[PDB]
Amino acid sequence: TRGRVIQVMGPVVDVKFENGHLPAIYNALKIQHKARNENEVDIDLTLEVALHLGDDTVRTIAMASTDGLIRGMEVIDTGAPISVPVGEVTLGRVFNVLGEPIDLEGDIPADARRDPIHRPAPKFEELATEVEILETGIKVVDLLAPYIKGGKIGLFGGAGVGKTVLIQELIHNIAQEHGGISVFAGVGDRTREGNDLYHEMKDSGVISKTAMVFGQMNEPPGARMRVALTGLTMAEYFRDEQGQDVLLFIDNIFRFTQAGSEVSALLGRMPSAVGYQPTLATEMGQLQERITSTAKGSITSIQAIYVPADDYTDPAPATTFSHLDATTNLERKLAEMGIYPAVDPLASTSRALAPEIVGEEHYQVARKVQQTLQRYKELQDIIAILGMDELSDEDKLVVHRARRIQFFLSQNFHVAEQFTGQPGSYVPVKETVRGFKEILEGKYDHLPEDAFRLVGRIEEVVEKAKAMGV
Amino acid sequence: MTRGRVIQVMGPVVDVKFENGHLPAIYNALKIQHKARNENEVDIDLTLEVALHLGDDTVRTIAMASTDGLIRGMEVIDTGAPISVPVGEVTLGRVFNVLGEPIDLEGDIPADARRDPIHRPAPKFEELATEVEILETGIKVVDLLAPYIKGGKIGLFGGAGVGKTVLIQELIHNIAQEHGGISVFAGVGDRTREGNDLYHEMKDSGVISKTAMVFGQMNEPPGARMRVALTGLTMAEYFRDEQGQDVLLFIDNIFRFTQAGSEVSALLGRMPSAVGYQPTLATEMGQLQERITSTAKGSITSIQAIYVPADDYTDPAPATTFSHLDATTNLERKLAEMGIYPAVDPLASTSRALAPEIVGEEHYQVARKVQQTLQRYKELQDIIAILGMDELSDEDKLVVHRARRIQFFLSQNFHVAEQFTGQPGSYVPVKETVRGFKEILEGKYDHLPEDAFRLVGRIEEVVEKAKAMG
Amino acid sequence: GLTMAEYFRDEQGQDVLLFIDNIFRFTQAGSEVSALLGRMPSAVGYQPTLATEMGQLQERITSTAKGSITSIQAIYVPADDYTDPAPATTFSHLDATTNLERKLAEMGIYPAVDPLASTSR
Amino acid sequence: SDVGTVIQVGDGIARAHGLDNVMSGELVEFANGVMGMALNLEENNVGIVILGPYTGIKEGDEVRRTGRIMEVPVGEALIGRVVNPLGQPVDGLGPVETTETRPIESRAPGVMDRRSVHEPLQTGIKAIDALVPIGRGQRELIIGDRQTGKTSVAIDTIINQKDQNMISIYVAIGQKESTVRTVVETLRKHGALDYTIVVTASASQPAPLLFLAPYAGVAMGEYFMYKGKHVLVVYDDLSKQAAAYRELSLLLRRPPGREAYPGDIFYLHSRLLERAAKLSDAKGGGSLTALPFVETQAGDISAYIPTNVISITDGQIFLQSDLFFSGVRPAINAGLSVSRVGGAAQIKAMKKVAGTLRLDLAAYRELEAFAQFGSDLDKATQAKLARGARTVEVLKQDLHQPIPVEKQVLIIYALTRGFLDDIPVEDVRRFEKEFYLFLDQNGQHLLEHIRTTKDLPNEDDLNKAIEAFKKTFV
Amino acid sequence: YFMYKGKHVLVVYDDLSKQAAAYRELSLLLRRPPGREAYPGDIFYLHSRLLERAAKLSDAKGGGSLTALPFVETQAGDISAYIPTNVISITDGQIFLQSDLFFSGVRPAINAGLSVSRVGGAAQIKAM
Amino acid sequence: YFMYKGKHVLVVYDDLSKQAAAYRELSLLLRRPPGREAYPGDIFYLHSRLLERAAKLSDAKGGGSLTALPFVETQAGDISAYIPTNVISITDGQIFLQSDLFFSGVRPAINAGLSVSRVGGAAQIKAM
Amino acid sequence: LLDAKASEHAARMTAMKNATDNANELIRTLTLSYNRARQAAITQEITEIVAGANAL
Ligand SMILES: Nc1ncnc2c1ncn2[C@@H]1O[C@H](COP(=O)(O)OP(=O)(O)OP(=O)(O)O)[C@@H](O)[C@H]1O
Ligand SMILES: Nc1ncnc2c1ncn2[C@@H]1O[C@H](COP(=O)(O)OP(=O)(O)OP(=O)(O)O)[C@@H](O)[C@H]1O
Ligand SMILES: Nc1ncnc2c1ncn2[C@@H]1O[C@H](COP(=O)(O)OP(=O)(O)O)[C@@H](O)[C@H]1O
Ligand SMILES: [Mg+2]
Ligand SMILES: [Mg+2]
Ligand SMILES: [Mg+2]
């Protein structure tokens, strides 16, 4: 009971299994062939099943390029979904979508258990709703949009704003804070960044308690689509057996939505909206709903999103926005201003900025900060085109402190070691919230604004000025 | 005559197979009435309209009631004629569905009553008449500044909250009260709550036996919503043919007649066109609006409310309706925010029956001086807004004083406002309308304050109100 | 027409002047007869083979060493929209292009030539 | 016969051979145990939309007919439990036994059967009850951007419905399982799950279940409407129902209409909402009022689904993203929020203070656009400043705690008659908290008066009784 | 018939835009794929096959004539739309009649800058 | 081949959009299900197969390079279209040229506001 | 000089107010044309989807 290939149309293939032996949907298939003659080409290729057709035939998608496929090749049926090896063995390694290790360190044995990629989501009975503030050590995120365990978190931006630099600073700070497993998925990631990140994590020695999944842009669209679910199935083993908080990072899900749109067009369905497939909310929900806090522990996730043209009504961002618990917006104007990670104080929102979850002082502090920056945002054009001396002395006070606040949300970073070389550091929550209480009190208003860039404490700001001698 | 069987059900659409070759014509009617043979079945009573032939004796139909519980192989009978509405005096003062059965529990019509086909070929070019008579509605604004004419299609357009059903009741009652004009009402795609409100507002006004009513509402399948509009026409055609008298026909919303046609065309399977409408927009619209006429016996003048789909008059449905209409009245929200009622804008409202001879060169010249006065006010208040009142000389100052008198006197007091505000009402013939406005245009009456004119019937009523007020 | 101009510049070797009155109607006539021929629409109802067949014609009209052709053509933009496929494919092939715009003509300026969008090598 | 074989499987759609005596809408059960509605009985191949996970089904799996039209089981047992649209529980409390079943698709009450609406539905939101009245059998639309507090207003409306016999319903359409759990626990904490049912189909569920979830929601309410008890139905979001129907239609190959929705979208929504109206005194005087919710991109209400729905409903309530992020809570805009049936159901005591409040907010909202100077005109302009400032202070509400009606009337009277005008603006809120408890202790005669009369307290002692509180406030 | 015999003629078509709409409706009742604004490309050939039978024959043929005045309806003055420009390519001039002047009391008004005749001078008498 | 020997290389593609159009016309004639515009769904994969061969090989592999400079012509300042968004997602930077800058005297016209280089800073000489 | 400076601030206030009115009107006209252009593009896209769907 092995199938035979009967059409090829690029990524799509058709296989005519003998009836009585048809695979399920989302099942997996192997081609291994060695060429009989000189003209032929040796092939090792896997396919996934995507819908059934009229008689015996099944319509499938290919995870490696179909070049060299004859008609009438034998297809092996695995009888199961794409199976990913799960265990502690995967700590430190880099994998492809099918679970083979890309790095040359070694090969996972056949004897180990492997878990299916596709599994039903958490039920209504099993789910729970704990609330705890996740101390990330990033001065904007901890002050103005506090992250929470158990939940989907979102980073929205254009291109080249800091999304990957920031995701690296997260992975490093969490590896210092806890020996909690991390899984990183580069879904449709440029093969260049994969080299940068693998060597940065090997050279800072952060990789001992992490795993990595990659699918590059030069992969078929189906292989770009299924890479996020491999990362899910790995993080799910660590929660269910080890029972501890296991972060899942996804490098950009915009490529994932587009890979689904291209697969639907190859399957011959009819577009909608700006050409996205019909089943946009379904597929994305299927992914996003597994990220949860059931009774064993957590799988809190931090994801980044490309917003094509600074208009957020495009289907992929708009469909994503409902699922996310807390979202911070990255704007290129601040990144080019050289204050980092570029996150807008006014446009960032979270569920967790309420006194019952975060804390009484934290609520009063954050709302004073945002009111100060909002009053600065409406005062700059008068400052530009009337004389700056015309601003009232109370508004002049709001100006002076808004300058300091805007700079002191910048922070010196371990990931800057590659780009600029400086050491950086980590800030616990208490020191962020107190330092901003120091900023808002105003006794330190004598120290100059230039000092406040790229620092981790108000004592560091005193030191930098001290070098300047202030 | 003969008996068929059903062979497809695809929502409202049903396909039927007539074995003998004794096929039905287009727009013919077929009936299913069935009672359960086994405990598994459902009892049903169904009218089908034929809409295409499709070969091999098969016929494609659209149902006038929901198709739930239809089996395959269930039988049909052939009526032999179009859907036949009852016509006579036996349909006065009573409410029906599309099939001609009574919605009211008050009773039903006997088997002796004659029935007219709804679908009948239009009147010939020899049978029309060119003579134009003004319909004298008694509404001061409409009769002065956009005179309605017998045989004329008239359109009401306006904002979501202005007065449209209030005016349709106000015209119905005025015509029945004094002119005695027997008149028919069709509801297409309006709320069922207002269907019962209109029934009780008729009963409260006492205008009940004189009129007749048909309803097809938003719960109806699209085919029934489409054909109820033609039932109202068929009743008015009986009144101006056989009883040979003046008639008036009301349609509550014509756009949903077009929209129901687009939904049926898609179920029928014909390609969309333009902004997704059916191909046959202009002919299906035209065949209705071409039967409304003033033939040698009597007219069917009609008032219709039009909703522009997206504020876009350039859209295909409003443009195609807009080509048939002879007089248009526009109702305006920025007037209705004041005490001005009905909120009719004279500047937007137009009539192709304001011909200088037909109204009368005295009515023509008075009407043009009113319109000129309001257009000058429209620009002159922009000049006052940018420069000032004290920037304008005496005559312009008198024009603004007169324009305030004109706008307030155009408001009127009526029976529907007895429920809303409890004022008794008024009635005005056209000769009184022109007389009174002529005297206001001379301006000797300008001593009464603007507050006095707010809602009034005749200039003599203004005289009674002013002195008493103080 | 082109086959005539080709013979004179090759065999006789004179410089030749070619005028084509409106070359858009060649592509539009292709758009009419292509759907009946039996091949799916493209970006606004045009045939698939827009650029290959229009390029095939335009690449013959060339000044070889044997003898020069200068050729002056006009192209009707299907509406006042240049982003349409048939104008878009033919903007590449022309050494000097004149854009005539309606808005200037209504001001009464003739010939209505777009000063900013006129390009020549 | 009854049996047939599946012979295609799409992305949740299927097609089946056999089933010759099937009928349109019949529920069909597959061998796996998921069930499907037979949408199209074409010439040989029955279209069979699958509700639930479809992966297990293969070509040649048996498919069989239940014998029944699409129906949800209902009864008195359901109240206090959480069920999926097909009517099975997800809470974990065990099986639920219901002895009656109602078709999800039915003829609504005809135009002979209905009535005018005249008895108010007290929410306990100050701004809704004061300015945008609702009544049993009204259809009312709450519209606004994401993260604007709409579900807070729904849960405030479903709590504070205790003595009034408003059997209520909450329908969760596509929602996050964590928020459905959070709301169910908030209902359980406030002692409010004795009189309400909760229905859920979540994003992991395929789109046909989302499309069916509102119809089964109203079908539960119809038992109460027939019997005679009042009802309320709340939908978490209708826009996601529109998106689920679009996906379902396009997988069935139907061509799109305007703005890539099918045109059948107006028939779908108008079918669903116009079953919500008050029955006649002959048929039991029941009710089925409904609260659709719909979301607007950028806050533009002129889009396709908003205007389509605004045509069907009898009012709109507009929630401002701009005010809500400025912190005014809950945020309601006086200019753009209004109801057509309102003005009749509202009680006589409230009618007197509601009209003055409506003019007060309408006049202050434009004047606030000019307000920041402090010295502009004499007191005539300022009085509108002073009144508008105290008005906006009084209309804010604490999160998730609903207000009682006779104290709601008495605070609006205190505001709209001017007793607050001397009271300093900074401490205006604290006045309400102290007043509610004091008025219970010292003012009970006024509460009895309103409960007796539907009318404002006897005016003679009303000032004196309010003055004693005003002195007690410090 | 009259022009070939030798007499003059004049034709008015009361609206050609309804002819285009009727062709669209027929073409889509057939299974022909739409183009701009759902109009098939055949719309240029239809109108061109209509309008260039109008002529001024020469003495060898018999000197007859057949001037034709077609009409087209613009929606909100959109002379830049498909069917207006389609027909404007075929005809030897245009007259554009303006609503803005007409409802400002100028009954009738012609928009000078939009309306041109390509046979000017030849047609006029010398005094003109 | 030259990069495998170890010498630096540069490849320029003078217009990728015309390659994409040749694929569209070839696929449509082959009766393949179309997508947005009418571009076949394979386009992003076809360009990624082209653009991910560019590399900077390690010292173990020879130290070579293959920098690439693809060009795309946008229609009227169009953006968010299918080919430009595909290529803008693949490439590690983008330069956007503005026509209204060019006709204002800036040459070569380059908008600093919308042009980004993710690699930037590292490549420059320390003085730069 | 006091009346001159006061009347200057009045003249600037009214000139800036009128200039704001002109800016608002222009924004309205542009928004109407932008909405018409986008809706025209979307209806063309939908027409291509239908033409593909019947052609295949
Ligand atoms: N003549 C009038 N006198 C007093 N109030 C009026 C008058 N005309 C309109 N109104 C006011 O405006 C409202 C208009 O209600 P109406 O029943 O006409 O709605 P409608 O516009 O027909 O609704 P729809 O367009 O959905 O059918 C009335 O409820 C009343 O408040
Ligand atoms: N009176 C109030 N005081 C304080 N907070 C409020 C008040 N009213 C509403 N909120 C807050 O508004 C927020 C709005 O979130 P809500 O729970 O309504 O989800 P939502 O607005 O429907 O967004 P989504 O539909 O995307 O989940 C809630 O966190 C709620 O705490
Ligand atoms: N702290 C920093 N110091 C110096 N340069 C930085 C810093 N953060 C970001 N950058 C620069 O900005 C770039 C941002 O690009 P990145 O967000 O990594 O792109 P992508 O998200 O597409 O991978 C970095 O590659 C680097 O060149
Ligand atoms: Mg990246
Ligand atoms: Mg109405
Ligand atoms: Mg909500």
Automatic annotation (TrEMBL), chain A:
Binding site for ATP: G157, G158, A159, G160, V161, G162, K163, T164, R351
Catalysis: reaction(s): 4 Na(+)(in) + ATP + H2O = 4 Na(+)(out) + ADP + phosphate + H(+); ATP + H2O + 4 H(+)(in) = ADP + phosphate + 5 H(+)(out)
The UniProt record lists the keyword Glycoprotein: no
Key words of the record: ATP synthesis, ATP-binding, Cell membrane, CF(1), Hydrogen ion transport, Ion transport, Membrane, Metal-binding, Nucleotide-binding, Translocase, Transport
Enzyme Commission identifier(s): 7.1.2.2
Record's bilayer topology term: Peripheral membrane protein
Binding site for Mg(2+) 1: T164
Binding site for ADP: G160, V161, G162, K163, T164, V165, Y340
PROSITE patterns the record matches: ATPASE_ALPHA_BETA (PS00152)
Pfam families documented for this protein: ATP-synt_ab, ATP-synt_ab_N, ATP-synt_VA_C
Family recorded in the similarity comment: Belongs to the ATPase alpha/beta chains family.
Protein name, as recorded: ATP synthase subunit beta
Organism of derivation: Bacillus sp. (strain PS3)
From TrEMBL, chain D:
Membrane topology: Peripheral membrane protein
Amino acids binding ADP 2: R340
Enzyme nomenclature, EC number: 7.1.2.2
Domain ATPase F1/V1/A1 complex alpha/beta subunit N-terminal per the UniProt entry, residue ranges: 1-67
Residues bound to ATP 4: S311, R340
List of residues binding ATP 2: Q147, T148, G149, Q397
Protein name (Swiss-Prot/TrEMBL): ATP synthase subunit alpha
Automatic annotation (TrEMBL), chain G:
Subcellular location: Cell membrane
Signal peptide: none
Biological role: Produces ATP from ADP in the presence of a proton gradient across the membrane. The gamma chain is believed to be important in regulating ATPase activity and the flow of protons through the CF(0) complex.
Subunit field text: F-type ATPases have 2 components, CF(1) - the catalytic core - and CF(0) - the membrane proton channel. CF(1) has five subunits: alpha(3), beta(3), gamma(1), delta(1), epsilon(1). CF(0) has three main subunits: a, b and c.
Family statement drawn from the similarity comment of this UniProt entry: Belongs to the ATPase gamma chain family.
Protein name per its UniProtKB record: ATP synthase gamma chain
Lineage of the organism: Bacteria, Bacillati, Bacillota, Bacilli, Bacillales
Annotated gene: uncG
